[PDB]
Structure formats: C-alpha cells, structure tokens
Motif scaffolding. Structure first.
Motif, PDB file in Angstrom:
ATOM      1  N   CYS A  57      29.381  38.986  36.602  1.00  0.00           N
ATOM      2  CA  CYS A  57      28.905  38.478  38.136  1.00  0.00           C
ATOM      3  C   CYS A  57      27.929  38.161  38.245  1.00  0.00           C
ATOM      4  O   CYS A  57      26.461  39.006  37.538  1.00  0.00           O
ATOM      5  N   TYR A 100      39.171  40.747  36.480  1.00  0.00           N
ATOM      6  CA  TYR A 100      37.763  41.247  36.099  1.00  0.00           C
ATOM      7  C   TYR A 100      36.622  41.177  36.712  1.00  0.00           C
ATOM      8  O   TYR A 100      35.693  42.204  36.021  1.00  0.00           O
ATOM      9  N   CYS A 101      36.949  40.321  38.060  1.00  0.00           N
ATOM     10  CA  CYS A 101      35.376  40.301  39.203  1.00  0.00           C
ATOM     11  C   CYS A 101      35.821  41.899  39.640  1.00  0.00           C
ATOM     12  O   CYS A 101      36.204  42.155  39.773  1.00  0.00           O
ATOM     13  N   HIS A 118      34.275  33.184  38.825  1.00  0.00           N
ATOM     14  CA  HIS A 118      35.406  34.181  39.524  1.00  0.00           C
ATOM     15  C   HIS A 118      36.147  34.691  40.458  1.00  0.00           C
ATOM     16  O   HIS A 118      36.755  35.217  40.879  1.00  0.00           O
TER      17      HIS A 118
END
Ligand SMILES: [Cl-]
Ligand SMILES: [Zn+2]
Ligand SMILES: [Zn+2]
Lengths: 122, 125
Positions: A57, A100-101, A118
């Motif tokens: 991120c 997965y963010c 993302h």
DNA sequence: GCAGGCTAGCCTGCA
DNA sequence: GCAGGCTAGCCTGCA
C-alpha cells in the motif's frame, strides 16, 4: 532528489490531466512519501512494471470528506492517481479495491491507499 | 503520554516471559507506533479480538541482522511479539507469514511486520 | 547545555 | 558460525 523521482513518474502519465496538474499531484504525493522509503519504492516499482507483482500500500492521510486538494482542485485521492497512471478516462464510482489492499479508500481508515494497482476498474 | 495502551496490551500477555521483559517489549513497540495511528489501532484491535478479522501490518524498522534488543536480550522482533501475545512456548523457525502480510520478516524490507496474527505457527524442519 | 539510560552495531569467545 | 556482551550514539527527563 525528489525532482529526479517526480520526472520518472511523470513519464508514466496517461494524459488525462494537464502537465501542470499532473506535476502538482506527483510532487504532492512524492513529498508525503519522502520519509516513507518502502511505500515510495513500492509506488515507483509498481508504476514502472505496470503492477506485474503484488505491491505494498502507498498511503497518504485521509481528509474528513475524503477529498484531496491539488492545485486548487478537489477530488478523491485514489481516483486522481488511478486517472493519472492507469485510466485517463476514469469516472466517479468506477474503482473497486483489490482483496489484499489494507488502506483502501472505502475502509475510511486514517490513511488512504493511492496505489492505482490496488484498485480494479468496474 | 499514553501508558493506557501498554497496560491494555500487558493484560493479553501469555506469561512466557517476565513481567519486566514484557513491559519493556510493549513500551518499545508502543513508542514506535506513537505517530502511526492506524498501525497502533490495528495492533490493539488484533490482540484484543484474537485476530478475528483481517488486520493491517504493524511494522517497526528492520535492523541490519534482523534482531531486536529488549532489556539486554536479542531476538527476532516478529518472534518476540508472537511469543508475548500468542505462543509463550514459541521456538526458533516456527513462524510462517500469512499471504496478505506485506512486511513479513522473510521479505527483508526496510520494515518488519510484528503483528502476531500475520504469522501462523509451523513445525521447525 | 547536561546526566543517565536504552540499544543497534560491532566484536569476540566457545563451538 | 552463532550467541551474547560492550558501548557510541541517540534520546529524554531536568533544573
Ligand atoms: Cl508474556
Ligand atoms: Zn493498498
Ligand atoms: Zn503484516
């Protein structure tokens, strides 16, 4: 230093904004990531490799309404940077975050993930 | 400033270490997360709820050799905090990171995730 | 500016 | 080739 980084990131812009606005948006983001080495490197390698491999991120502070001001203009931060590097024609409510963010815009955390890889276009 | 966070986290220790060691380890971690609000809140919530829902990475700066020194003792940081809040009997090479962890010890980033719920216990080879 | 405590980084002693 | 001990450098409580 940062000027060298900006220019490399400007080379990946999609032309969905004026050169002045894009420079303003990139400078603003790079300055915020100046003391966050890992996240800056995650942004540079994800932009250049077109999100080939999973990236971390890339976060900035969230405002109360969730809008970021760049060169007198307000807009959602994840939208400004996804428009800039991936989808020049991007509109409102067209971005869905990847599983997965951790700091995705929708989560209303203290931080917003502005990594355009993302998000997926919908 | 805020010692109320250290106290709440101390209540979740598994007793595998001394009270003095645990206090120093927690104080050291909380000080590093003092200006990282999201990461600190992710740690408090993950510990308290026993990692019920996915939590964000809780990272600290990686040392050259990977070990962290707490009260004169050196150990891997992810191991120190996993022993403290999850596995009091935890030994060397018994941790494997979860797929969604971005700053796992093994990745050798600038930062090391010390969220104990970002690691699962495995048998050492 | 100063006293003093914590530890990353470096070094070494058994193995 | 590790585990572990020594301390310069950094930080903080202080008056
Ligand atoms: Cl404990
Ligand atoms: Zn993200
Ligand atoms: Zn993690």
């Amino acid at each position: 230093a940062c000027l060298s980084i900006v220019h490399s990131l400007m080379c990946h812009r999609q032309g969905g904004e004026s050169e002045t606005f894009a420079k303003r948006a990139i400078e603003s983001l790079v300055k915020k990531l100046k003391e966050k080495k890992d996240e800056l490197d995650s942004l540079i390698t994800a932009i250049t490799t077109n999100g080939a491999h999973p990236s971390k991120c890339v976060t900035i502070q969230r405002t109360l309404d969730g809008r970021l001001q760049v060169a007198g203009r307000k807009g959602f931060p994840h939208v400004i940077y996804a428009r800039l590097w991936r989808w020049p024609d991007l509109h409102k409510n067209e971005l869905k975050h990847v599983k997965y963010c951790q700091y995705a815009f929708d989560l209303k955390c203290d931080s917003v993930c502005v990594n355009p890889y993302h998000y997926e276009r919908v």
